[PDB]
Motif scaffolding. Structure first.
Motif, PDB file in Angstrom:
ATOM      1  N   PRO B  62       6.000   5.760  -2.825  1.00  0.00           N
ATOM      2  CA  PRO B  62       6.888   6.264  -3.885  1.00  0.00           C
ATOM      3  C   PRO B  62       6.181   6.485  -5.212  1.00  0.00           C
ATOM      4  O   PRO B  62       6.548   7.381  -5.972  1.00  0.00           O
ATOM      5  CB  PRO B  62       7.963   5.173  -3.991  1.00  0.00           C
ATOM      6  CG  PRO B  62       7.359   3.961  -3.354  1.00  0.00           C
ATOM      7  CD  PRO B  62       6.494   4.495  -2.257  1.00  0.00           C
ATOM      8  N   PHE B  66       7.570   9.667  -5.809  1.00  0.00           N
ATOM      9  CA  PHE B  66       8.608   9.767  -6.843  1.00  0.00           C
ATOM     10  C   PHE B  66       8.024  10.094  -8.212  1.00  0.00           C
ATOM     11  O   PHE B  66       8.621  10.855  -8.984  1.00  0.00           O
ATOM     12  CB  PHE B  66       9.415   8.469  -6.897  1.00  0.00           C
ATOM     13  CG  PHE B  66      10.418   8.421  -8.003  1.00  0.00           C
ATOM     14  CD1 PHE B  66      11.577   9.170  -7.934  1.00  0.00           C
ATOM     15  CD2 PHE B  66      10.211   7.607  -9.108  1.00  0.00           C
ATOM     16  CE1 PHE B  66      12.502   9.123  -8.949  1.00  0.00           C
ATOM     17  CE2 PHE B  66      11.138   7.553 -10.123  1.00  0.00           C
ATOM     18  CZ  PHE B  66      12.288   8.305 -10.035  1.00  0.00           C
ATOM     19  N   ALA B  70       8.179  14.189  -9.266  1.00  0.00           N
ATOM     20  CA  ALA B  70       8.439  14.467 -10.672  1.00  0.00           C
ATOM     21  C   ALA B  70       7.335  15.327 -11.256  1.00  0.00           C
ATOM     22  O   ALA B  70       7.607  16.360 -11.875  1.00  0.00           O
ATOM     23  CB  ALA B  70       8.560  13.168 -11.466  1.00  0.00           C
ATOM     24  N   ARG B  73       7.731  18.550 -10.033  1.00  0.00           N
ATOM     25  CA  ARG B  73       8.852  19.228 -10.676  1.00  0.00           C
ATOM     26  C   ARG B  73       8.566  19.520 -12.143  1.00  0.00           C
ATOM     27  O   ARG B  73       8.930  20.591 -12.646  1.00  0.00           O
ATOM     28  CB  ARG B  73      10.118  18.390 -10.550  1.00  0.00           C
ATOM     29  CG  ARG B  73      11.371  19.085 -11.022  1.00  0.00           C
ATOM     30  CD  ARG B  73      12.541  18.140 -10.974  1.00  0.00           C
ATOM     31  NE  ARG B  73      12.390  17.092 -11.974  1.00  0.00           N
ATOM     32  CZ  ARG B  73      13.156  16.011 -12.047  1.00  0.00           C
ATOM     33  NH1 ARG B  73      14.133  15.821 -11.172  1.00  0.00           N
ATOM     34  NH2 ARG B  73      12.937  15.119 -12.995  1.00  0.00           N
TER      35      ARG B  73
END
Lengths: 263, 182
Positions: B62, B66, B70, B73
């Motif tokens: 993660p 994660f 991000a 993104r």
RNA sequence: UACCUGGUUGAUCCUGCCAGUAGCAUAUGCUUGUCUCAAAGAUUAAGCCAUGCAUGUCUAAGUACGCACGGCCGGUACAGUGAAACUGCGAAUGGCUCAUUAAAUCAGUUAUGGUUCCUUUGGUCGCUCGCUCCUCUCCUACUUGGAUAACUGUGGUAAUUC
RNA sequence: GGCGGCGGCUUUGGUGACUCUAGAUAACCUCGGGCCGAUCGCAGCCCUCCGUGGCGGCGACGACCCAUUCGAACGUCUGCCCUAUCAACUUUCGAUGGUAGUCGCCGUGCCUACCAUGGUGACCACGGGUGACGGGGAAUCAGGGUUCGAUUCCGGAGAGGGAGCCUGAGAAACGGCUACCACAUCCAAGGAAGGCAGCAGGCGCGCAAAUUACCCACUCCCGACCCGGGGAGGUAGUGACGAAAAAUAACAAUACAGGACUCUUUCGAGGCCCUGUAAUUGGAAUGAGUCCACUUUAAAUCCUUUAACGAGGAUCCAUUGGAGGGCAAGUCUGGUCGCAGCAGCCGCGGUAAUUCCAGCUCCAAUAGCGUAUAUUAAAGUUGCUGCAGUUAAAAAGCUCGUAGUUGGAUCUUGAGGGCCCGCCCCUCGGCGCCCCCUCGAUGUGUCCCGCGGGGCCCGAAGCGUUUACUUUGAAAAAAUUAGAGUGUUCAAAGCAGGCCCGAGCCGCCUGGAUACCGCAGCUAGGAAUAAUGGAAUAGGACCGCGGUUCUAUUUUGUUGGUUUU
RNA sequence: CGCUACUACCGAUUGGAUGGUUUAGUGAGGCCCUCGGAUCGGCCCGCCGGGGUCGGCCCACGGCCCUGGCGGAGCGCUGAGAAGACGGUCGAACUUGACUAUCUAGAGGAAGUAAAAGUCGUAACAAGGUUUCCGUAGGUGAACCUGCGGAAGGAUCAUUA
């Protein structure tokens, strides 16, 4: 020279679970002495003007405590920084709103409106059971509420539904295996679920292997285990963030949702 | 309380090939000085190494996912990276000028009232544009995808629609006192 | 950014330091238009410190006999208010500074089943379980005694928070 | 049933653990010298009944006596800079141990009585050196590493230095006192009054550091307390510490100077991209300003909002460094002539100076740039990774030889599905066994069985010799830092944020992730690897038992007696 | 060896200054304890103000007692208790020397570095005119010379039936 105890307390070197800011205000609320140890405790003024935000200055919150609109544990509070610990209901006497102080599995206090049925009793896992002087047994819970004449079948870590109207204890729930226990502290904060296992050691340092509701099985000590009733039997409502356990890749799917979805 | 530098300094003082290469990016994109080169140079070294470290992490982490998704993104919300490739190998292949095109300045030069990239920095600096309901005065602004869809005249630019300040009035005074003989 | 660059010598290959080379963080040279942030008597003097100021505080609830203020409203003690004053509490903390101390501080981990703690949270307050009722004659319970502040004036004091 | 036989009921809170709670009896005392209201506000009652006795809430304060909270202080483990041109240290003074008591909030050689000679070191003790507050953390380095922590935090330590007392729960308080020691005041000469390492400010020192500012509003703090006070703190000032954004004008037109291009055999022309330069500007702007105004907040202040004004030019006009190389850019122009200077280093200057000194031109970065010093890298010139030791630095004259540090080999665990599993050469669960409430034959209780508790003994497990090790978790201040949410107009950053409804939505709503924990420990998986175990002139397993004998206590109703299992 | 600066050395002056100890001295200063009684009340009784009773039912004033006043009295014998003060206790501290450390004066001593073109001889480099050098030991103005044992880093890896 530390010639007496500190009667002051500033910010950021403050507990993070109170969710205070950085150095924007250079002093902390500094909770009073009372029933619970000071880090467990939560000031009213954080819950009032920093969580519900009906006030904005401190002398108002003094006068709001002079309004005496605040009943913590069913008992009239005029303290802006009352040492209220765990499962403590807060009766906001003017808005008619009850809120019981329980922790999230995110790591934050839950602004948690329990029903007023659930406000008369709070479940205190007991702290001691002692035969006091002249041969008198007792129960005293974690909020130091010295109660004479306990139940004659209770033992250690039993949860009493503490009648917050009176004290003067009502019925108990025995410390049993597999109970719902909001595990608090460390990497297991705010986790509710069944017990399923306990480990013992003579001396000190007993760990308790807890499998929660999501299936996270973890061995975390009995100090981190506050029993909240019976297994698969809650006695207040479940807090925000499910009150069990959350993953962070799912938490972005949570944080994208209700922002710009409401109103 | 806390501050940091947003530019960078190389360990070689005079590397004239680089020094005239930095003169290109100013002349190709309209920059102030070599600090505007060194500002994105300060960022992009961290971007590749963040792409490098997540690549060297074990998969299904993660802290790789994660954080990285991000970072996938965040590089795509601004439209510098495209997420049609969307892996750490290609993030090792990005450059300075992908950000420079997503600056406010070049998009004004690409789209709108800029004839030059001298001119494109001026229209931000002399506040002729609104990128939102926002007089935006920063040329190093680096934009998002939606940001390129609301760059207009500002309502403080009295030409192209706006409340008069003192300049179109002065340009009216060029015909009403510059031509009105007083 | 995992780098080097210049310098030994007739020339060369070395070792090898030199010096260039970037980071820095004060001191500073020179210069500086906006707008956001801000370290700053540590270095040197834990030096002396002038001065300005840095912990006060009355609740419907300790004592109102303010010379006050406001009232007939007064008597059993009566004032609305209330300076003071006595009484209750903080004044130890805060800030500041690191001189100091080398397993010492401190840091992490533990324990007081050795220790004490205002305050707060909660219990505990009829009784002598009647001296096998002084506590029914011990008859003070509808309540005790004297003794001070403020108040006053006499004041003394080079001077004093005398 | 005044009992002799035979049987029957047959009875205590917690801790891992205290001579724990609890009990009782015998008391003990605490005197000016443990305790259970001689109080104060708010307010409703009953009176065989008239003003009292019965009495009830509100809360004031108080204490008995404890839980609490706050912790404190002491005790555990792990952890610190330099030095052997510091090798042994510690008690005559208790050094270290015991016993005994004293005392202290109390553990304690705390302390002595007393006894013992302890206690401890080359693993560098003992001692000396360090601006040694320490740590959270900080800067830099590919990694490895290296420098910092007085410094917005934590903990410690002092308020001139000690000492002694005090107050209170907490102070040897220097915004107490007492005195001393070193300083400072009034003095009228008696005496009196003083310590900013609080905010400032002042001087002082220096290279080096801002208000003798404003406000108790924000923050909190103390109170008898909403009230107040606070140089805490906030607020601005000071403030190229440093950081963030990034201006001092574009833009064309013109023209040239062309590069495609098109024409042209090319030439050349047409031809724009233009960019310099020209005369210019042309509309087109903009705060840098100034400025009504709204704003701002303790009041402000700035900010942003701005009506309005504020650029064709040499402007509203950037700098600081370099051109001999290294090192970018003057084989410039002038002067100088080994002079003056320059030059970190390598180096110029001794006359046709690319090193000077300037001009000019250029380069460099840029509201900075340069210097000084400091330190980090570069530096594999400290080399743990990862130095070199024949001849450049560096194998001792040689050998034994301890610490030191290293060390030889060697013991066993097939199926399921296209790897996965357990295996091989008692405390739980639990197949069994009996007991017991008994479960299906049976509904104080059997024979399917403890599955329920067990009890025992198994596969299983305390097992058998264990660790290192690895792994599991817990634990692992916050800040920091990594880094998520997050448009700070970018950004330094913050912890944010986003809506609908007209503004009755009387609201709805996201959030404020996760990473890190020297160690030591803890935890539990592993058991390779490295140590590690046993039976040796016999020991280990089996109730093999035996004979002896000590004693522990249940039932014989009980006790008593002895007696045994 | 001449010019000549730097630098530590060392140094009379039992130089000086500063700091740390340490012997013992003095012990402030409070603490403990011994006190102390400056002094302040109670009980007392004398007398009346009231009450009561036992001059008195006139139980009444007053005697008396209670109490109010008041003083004396033994100031009895108490309650409080001051300064002072006891001896310790810690101990500021200072003294005394010792003691060390730091800083510095320091004549001067004596050198090295620097410092260069002043001077001798020619050490040694070519085998450097006596090849070099070690250890050591003397010598020699000095470079050095020699001896004793080395070594090759020499000019020899090479002398024989």
């Amino acid at each position: 020279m530390a010639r007496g105890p500190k009667k002051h307390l500033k910010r950021v070197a403050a507990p993070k679970h109170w969710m205070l800011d950085k150095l924007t205000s250079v002093f902390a609320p500094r909770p009073s002495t009372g029933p619970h140890k000071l880090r467990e405790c939560l000031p009213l003024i954080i819950f009032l003007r920093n969580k519900l935000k009906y006030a904005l200055t401190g002398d108002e919150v003094k006068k709001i405590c002079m309004q005496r609109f605040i009943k913590i544990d069913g008992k009239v509070r005029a303290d802006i920084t009352y040492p209220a610990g765990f499962m403590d209901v807060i009766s906001i006497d003017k808005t008619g709103e009850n809120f019981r102080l329980i922790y999230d599995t995110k790591g934050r206090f839950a602004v948690h409106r329990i029903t007023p049925e659930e406000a008369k009793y709070k479940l205190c896992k007991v702290r001691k059971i002692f035969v006091g002087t002249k041969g008198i047994p007792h129960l005293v819970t974690h909020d130091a509420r010295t109660i004479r004449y306990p139940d004659p079948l209770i033992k250690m870590n039993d949860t009493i539904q503490i009648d917050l109207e009176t004290g003067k204890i009502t019925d108990f729930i025995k410390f049993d295996t597999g109970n719902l226990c909001m595990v608090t502290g460390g990497a297991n904060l705010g986790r509710i679920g069944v017990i399923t296992n306990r480990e013992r050691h003579p001396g000190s340092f007993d760990v308790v292997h807890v499998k929660d509701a999501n299936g996270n099985s973890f061995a975390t000590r009995l100090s981190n285990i506050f029993v909240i009733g019976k297994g698969n039997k809650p006695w207040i409502s479940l807090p925000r963030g499910k009150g069990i356990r959350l993953t962070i890749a799912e938490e972005r799917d949570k944080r994208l949702a209700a922002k710009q979805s409401s109103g | 309380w806390v501050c940091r530098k947003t530019y960078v300094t190389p360990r070689r003082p005079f590397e004239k090939s680089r020094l005239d290469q930095e003169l290109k990016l100013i002349g190709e994109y309209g920059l102030r000085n070599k600090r505007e080169v060194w500002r994105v140079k300060f960022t992009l070294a961290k971007i590749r190494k963040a792409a490098r470290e997540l690549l060297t992490l074990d998969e299904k982490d993660p802290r790789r996912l994660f954080e990285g998704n991000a970072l996938l993104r965040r590089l795509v919300r601004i439209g510098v990276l495209d997420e049609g490739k969307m892996k750490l190998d290609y993030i090792l292949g990005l450059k300075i000028e992908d950000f420079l095109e997503r600056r406010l300045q070049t998009q004004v030069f690409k789209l709108g009232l800029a004839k030059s990239i001298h001119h494109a920095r001026v229209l931000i600096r002399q506040r002729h544009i609104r990128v939102r309901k926002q007089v935006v005065n920063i040329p190093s602004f680096i934009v998002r995808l939606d940001s390129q869809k609301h760059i207009d005249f500002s309502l403080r630019s009295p030409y192209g629609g706006g409340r008069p300040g003192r300049v179109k009035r002065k340009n009216a005074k060029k015909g009403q006192g510059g031509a009105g003989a007083g």
